[PDB]
Design a protein around this motif. Structure first.
Motif, mmCIF file in Angstrom:
data_model
loop_
_atom_site.group_PDB
_atom_site.id
_atom_site.type_symbol
_atom_site.label_atom_id
_atom_site.label_comp_id
_atom_site.label_asym_id
_atom_site.label_seq_id
_atom_site.Cartn_x
_atom_site.Cartn_y
_atom_site.Cartn_z
ATOM 1 N N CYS A 160 57.243 38.865 40.718
ATOM 2 C CA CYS A 160 56.515 39.421 39.976
ATOM 3 C C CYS A 160 57.393 40.124 39.076
ATOM 4 O O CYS A 160 57.298 40.225 37.898
ATOM 5 C CB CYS A 160 54.494 39.796 40.620
ATOM 6 N N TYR A 161 58.075 40.839 39.732
ATOM 7 C CA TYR A 161 58.870 42.395 38.591
ATOM 8 C C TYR A 161 59.304 41.414 37.381
ATOM 9 O O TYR A 161 59.839 42.393 36.108
ATOM 10 C CB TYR A 161 59.639 42.884 39.137
ATOM 11 N N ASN A 162 59.749 39.860 37.498
ATOM 12 C CA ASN A 162 60.702 39.142 36.837
ATOM 13 C C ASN A 162 59.388 38.500 36.216
ATOM 14 O O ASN A 162 60.115 37.225 35.928
ATOM 15 C CB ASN A 162 62.121 38.796 36.766
ATOM 16 N N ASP A 163 58.297 39.214 35.790
ATOM 17 C CA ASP A 163 57.610 37.309 35.443
ATOM 18 C C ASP A 163 56.592 38.811 33.769
ATOM 19 O O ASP A 163 56.460 39.971 34.499
ATOM 20 C CB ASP A 163 56.942 37.223 36.643
ATOM 21 N N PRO A 164 55.984 38.037 32.951
ATOM 22 C CA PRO A 164 55.486 39.249 31.853
ATOM 23 C C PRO A 164 53.964 38.584 32.184
ATOM 24 O O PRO A 164 53.181 39.711 32.002
ATOM 25 C CB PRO A 164 55.571 37.519 31.409
ATOM 26 N N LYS A 165 53.693 38.214 33.608
ATOM 27 C CA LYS A 165 52.242 38.712 34.219
ATOM 28 C C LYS A 165 51.952 39.119 34.934
ATOM 29 O O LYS A 165 51.212 39.673 36.379
ATOM 30 C CB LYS A 165 51.500 36.991 34.186
ATOM 31 N N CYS A 166 53.491 40.473 35.378
ATOM 32 C CA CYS A 166 53.572 41.321 36.227
ATOM 33 C C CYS A 166 54.026 42.002 35.492
ATOM 34 O O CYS A 166 55.581 42.705 36.405
ATOM 35 C CB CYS A 166 53.386 40.764 37.387
ATOM 36 N N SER A 167 54.399 42.721 34.615
ATOM 37 C CA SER A 167 55.150 43.669 34.192
ATOM 38 C C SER A 167 54.568 44.823 34.191
ATOM 39 O O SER A 167 55.199 46.131 34.014
ATOM 40 C CB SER A 167 54.932 43.801 32.226
ATOM 41 N N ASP A 168 53.816 45.200 35.206
ATOM 42 C CA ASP A 168 53.210 46.159 36.169
ATOM 43 C C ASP A 168 54.679 47.058 35.794
ATOM 44 O O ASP A 168 55.903 46.603 36.211
ATOM 45 C CB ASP A 168 52.200 46.027 37.320
ATOM 46 N N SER A 169 53.966 48.511 37.151
ATOM 47 C CA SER A 169 55.329 49.404 37.535
ATOM 48 C C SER A 169 54.726 49.420 39.354
ATOM 49 O O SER A 169 54.405 51.023 39.162
ATOM 50 C CB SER A 169 55.311 50.284 37.186
#
Length: 25
Positions: A13-22
């Protein structure tokens, strides 16, 4: 705030806009 450092999805998900969290490393 930060996700879990034990989820394989946190890496995919790290490589997705819907999961730009940290995820806490």
């Amino acid at each position: 705030n930060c996700w879990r450092a034990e989820s394989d999805e946190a890496r995919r998900c790290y490589n997705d806009p819907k999961c730009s969290d940290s995820v806490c490393k």
